[PDB]
Design a protein around this ligand. Structure first.
Ligand SMILES: *[C@@H]1O[C@H](CO)[C@@H](O)[C@H](O)[C@H]1NC(C)=O
Ligand SMILES: *[C@@H]1O[C@H](CO)[C@@H](O)[C@H](O)[C@H]1NC(C)=O
Ligand SMILES: *[C@@H]1O[C@H](CO)[C@@H](O)[C@H](O)[C@H]1NC(C)=O
Ligand SMILES: *[C@@H]1O[C@H](CO)[C@@H](O)[C@H](O)[C@H]1NC(C)=O
Ligand SMILES: *[C@@H]1O[C@H](CO)[C@@H](O)[C@H](O)[C@H]1NC(C)=O
Ligand SMILES: *[C@@H]1O[C@H](CO)[C@@H](O)[C@H](O)[C@H]1NC(C)=O
Ligand SMILES: *[C@@H]1O[C@H](CO)[C@@H](O)[C@H](O)[C@H]1NC(C)=O
Ligand SMILES: *[C@@H]1O[C@H](CO)[C@@H](O)[C@H](O)[C@H]1NC(C)=O
Ligand SMILES: *[C@@H]1O[C@H](CO)[C@@H](O)[C@H](O)[C@H]1NC(C)=O
Lengths: 115, 216, 323, 95
């Protein structure tokens, strides 16, 4: 069979750039600046060791973002920022100050009725 | 005030709503375009098949129109049913939040959004609802030595509510979600067991409200 | 699924006919993508509710509560708690066969190793920071002083734990042990997951086998039919293939939509538990599982999640006249 | 491969995020026809004596090559039709 999967055009908004990085899904970078991924053959995005927040989800952890001149990059998504709680047998941390935050939450209720 | 700035420039936060309105008009569009498709018949105009041919042939063709269009409905319809239930579950969730969050105070965690929940203010939106969740988020923390228990005379003292803490010297019992130290007296602490069993009990002296009240 | 390539296998003759059904081919991709998108939204909602990745401290003193079972295994190349390996062995060619005809399996956005970092974080904060990490910045608290609260949650005064700690330690640990064999010695516990994976691979097999059906057409092979049957007449034949196959997709697609809508419901149930049960302490009776609930430990499993609910069940009764 | 995304999006402004546009399949460089006498059509079709239909003659034929050209070039034949497979195409697909 053919490589298939599908072509995928990774782009920052057309407003930002007209540059795109093409992802060939689930293929070998032969039959096509090239990089081989877990999700397939990616073209036109420079691999970046610096792991950042997942921005444009691609596959298998590969997440692309536009910033650095500039070029679309591809990098292993860092899940979260890292922390290690400083923990002891009697160590406790009790908040002395707080905030009151208003977080919008949005839900559908009904949809357009038709006949 | 931050909310109104967000909405002022945010098209995305309504993505949930904007998607629902889209997906309907989408399938509505596609439903319409299916009126222009041949479906194998010689044309997608109903009458133009007729006036071209003598009807005993049209009876055959109009099948491939009907068989096509009738299907395209059942596709669209079966979609709506599925999509309806998707809204249906969302509507049930809205009733649950409207009921519990707004009309109550939700002990459930992160059902009303991050932080401990105070109240919610619903706001209507086209084919939807928008809650403003007012939540209580702690902020500034201070590392503090703690103990699960305090010996006094060999009795053990445990806090009624909150925990024994200490900056480094004076043991204070305080409520948990806010730092409000108070000197430790019997009204703060109840007696149980004795000093052997607890793991982590310290020494200290639990002041007595009553003892001074006597002395005169 | 590739609608054009699936229905009409490398043949323009059939491919042109498909254009006369209009947007069926495209709206199927629009349908399946809607599924495929929210799948990585489900896994997103469930596992990552936590802002930061916490990690357990270097040295484990919890007051006797062994966690080496459930905590990430530092010696595995993919760090996954000892238990999670029991799971990934139970759950399980279809590797390229489907991928012949345009049936593709896209990689889940989050690799399993990432899922195991979340369920490490959620489990790292649960242990050290109590429940506060879901409400904001995590607050280190002595684990034994955590469990004093989670008893106050269920109405047992904390003086029970400070006195019974050693006992409660053993009951906990010995309870964790049997969770291994509960999984290790029986393969039906994971049926829920196993059923999901099967039904997916099921319909795919069915969807493939539909390629070999005549559907009233002289031959199931499209290339052979185009090569032998005369273009004038072969048109009508290929219809019965297309009409058959094109229908047979909508059957498969509709199944996936319906089936995903179930998972979509099950995902929220997890995300509800993950938020309320793991991150907080649940007051909802038998929502977290039978008994008064203390805490829950998430554990990843293939295309699923597994919670270890630590619950408080009373035992020995004493008849006593009351007033 | 970028302009196809605008057609799929149906918007001159393609907002951020990944879009599936099209699928690419490698073209076959060339064709392999790998077949492994003469068939007695001059002995069947120019035969001198056909039996009737109560005892019709049957001749199993294999291990030879088809002269399907002059079948169509004969053109002295009243009723000649092929069911399922078309006669002209059957020149090369074989049996
Ligand atoms: C592009 O986006 C920026 C914000 O990032 C906005 O200020 C600008 O007006 C946008 N331009 C267009 C062409 O919409
Ligand atoms: C194809 O992909 C595999 C795995 O990445 C790689 O080992 C191989 O060299 C690639 N090329 C061939 C020969 O298919
Ligand atoms: C980034 O990772 C690649 C992996 O092959 C390595 O070859 C390269 O040297 C690394 N670059 C830096 C600066 O870490
Ligand atoms: C914690 O336990 C260890 C080992 O018993 C001990 O050395 C350390 O001082 C203890 N820390 C506190 C503050 O309880
Ligand atoms: C907490 O921080 C805010 C910042 O404006 C300050 O106004 C407030 O006084 C602080 N807490 C207290 C109890 O003062
Ligand atoms: C407590 O001490 C640790 C030491 O690493 C530090 O990381 C943490 O931020 C401190 N927390 C507070 C509340 O000061
Ligand atoms: C506490 O006070 C007692 C005497 O009442 C003393 O024996 C003990 O060493 C002190 N420290 C501890 C660990 O309780
Ligand atoms: C937990 O159990 C494992 C079983 O091998 C043991 O090796 C480990 O020492 C135990 N840890 C504690 C703290 O009991
Ligand atoms: C209480 O008495 C009843 C009736 O004799 C008996 O069935 C039950 O087991 C007793 N329960 C206890 C706590 O002994």
């Amino acid at each position: 069979p053919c490589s298939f999967g599908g072509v995928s055009v990774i782009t920052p908004g057309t407003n930002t750039s007209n540059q795109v990085a093409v992802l060939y899904q689930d293929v070998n970078c032969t039959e096509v600046n090239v990089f081989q991924t877990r999700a397939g053959c990616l073209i036109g995005a420079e691999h970046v060791n610096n792991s950042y927040e997942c921005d444009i989800p691609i596959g298998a952890g590969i997440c692309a973002s536009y910033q650095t001149s500039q070029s679309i990059i591809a990098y292993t998504m860092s899940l979260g920022a890292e922390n290690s709680v400083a923990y002891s047998n009697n160590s406790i941390a009790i908040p002395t100050n707080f905030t009151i935050s208003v977080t919008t939450e949005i839900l559908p209720v009904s949809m357009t009725k038709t006949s | 005030g931050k909310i109104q700035d967000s909405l002022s420039s945010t098209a995305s936060a309504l993505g949930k709503l904007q998607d629902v309105v889209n997906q309907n008009a989408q399938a509505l569009n596609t439903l319409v375009k299916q009126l222009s498709s041949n479906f194998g018949a010689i044309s997608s105009v109903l009458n133009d098949i007729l006036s071209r041919l003598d009807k005993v042939e049209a009876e055959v063709q109009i099948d491939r129109l009907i068989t096509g269009r009738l299907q395209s409905l059942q596709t669209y319809v079966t979609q709506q049913l599925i999509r309806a239930a998707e809204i249906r579950a969302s509507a049930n969730l809205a009733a649950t939040k409207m009921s519990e969050c707004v009309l109550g105070q939700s002990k459930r965690v992160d059902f009303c959004g991050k932080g401990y929940h105070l109240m919610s203010f619903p706001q209507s939106a086209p084919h939807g609802v928008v809650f403003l969740h007012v939540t209580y988020v702690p902020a500034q923390e201070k590392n503090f030595t703690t103990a699960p228990a305090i010996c006094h005379d060999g009795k053990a003292h445990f806090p009624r509510e909150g925990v024994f803490v200490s900056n480094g010297t004076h043991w204070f019992v305080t409520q948990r979600n806010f730092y409000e130290p108070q000197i430790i007296t019997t009204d703060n602490t109840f007696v149980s067991g004795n000093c052997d069993v607890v793991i982590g009990i310290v020494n200290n002296t639990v002041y007595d409200p009553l003892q001074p009240e006597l002395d005169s | 699924v590739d609608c054009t390539m699936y229905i009409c296998g490398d043949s323009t003759e059939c491919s042109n006919l498909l254009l006369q059904y209009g947007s069926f081919c495209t709206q199927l991709n629009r349908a399946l993508t809607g599924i495929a998108v929210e799948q990585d939204k489900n896994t997103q909602e469930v596992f990552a509710q936590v802002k930061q990745i916490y990690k357990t401290p270097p040295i484990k003193d919890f007051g006797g509560f062994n966690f080496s079972q459930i905590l990430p295994d530092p010696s595995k190349p993919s760090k996954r708690s000892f238990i999670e390996d029991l799971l990934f062995n139970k759950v399980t060619d279809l590797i390229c066969a489907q991928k012949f005809n345009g049936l593709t399996v896209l990689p889940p956005l989050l690799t399993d190793e990432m899922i195991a970092q979340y369920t490490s974080a959620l489990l790292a904060g649960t242990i050290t920071s109590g429940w506060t990490f879901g409400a904001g910045a995590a607050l280190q608290i002595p684990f034994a002083m955590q469990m004093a609260y989670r008893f106050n949650g269920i109405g047992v005064t904390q003086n029970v734990l400070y006195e019974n700690q050693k006992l409660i330690a053993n009951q906990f640990n010995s309870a964790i042990g049997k969770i291994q064999d509960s999984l290790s010695s029986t393969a039906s516990a994971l049926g829920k997951l196993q059923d999901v994976v099967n039904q997916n691979a099921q319909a795919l097999n069915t969807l493939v086998k539909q390629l070999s059906s005549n559907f009233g057409a002289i031959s199931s092979v499209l290339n052979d039919i185009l090569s032998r049957l005369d273009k004038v007449e072969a048109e009508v034949q290929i219809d019965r293939l297309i009409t058959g196959r094109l229908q047979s997709l909508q059957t498969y697609v509709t199944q996936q939509l319906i089936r995903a809508a179930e998972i979509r419901a099950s995902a929220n149930l997890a995300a509800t538990k993950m938020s309320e049960c793991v991150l907080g302490q649940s007051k909802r009776v038998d929502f977290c599982g039978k008994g008064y609930h203390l805490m829950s430990f998430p554990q990843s499993a293939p295309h699923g999640v597994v919670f270890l609910h630590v619950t408080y069940v009373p035992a020995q009764e004493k008849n006593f006249t009351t007033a | 491969p970028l302009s196809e995304t605008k057609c799929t999006l149906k918007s001159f402004t393609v907002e951020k995020g990944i879009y599936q546009t099209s699928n690419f399949r490698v073209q076959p460089t060339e064709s392999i026809v790998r077949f492994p006498n003469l068939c007695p059509f001059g002995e069947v079709f120019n035969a001198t004596r056909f039996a009737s239909v109560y005892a019709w003659n049957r001749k199993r034929i294999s291990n030879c090559v088809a002269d399907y050209s002059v079948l169509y070039n004969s053109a002295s034949f009243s009723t000649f039709k092929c069911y399922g497979v078309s006669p002209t195409k059957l020149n090369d697909l074989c049996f």
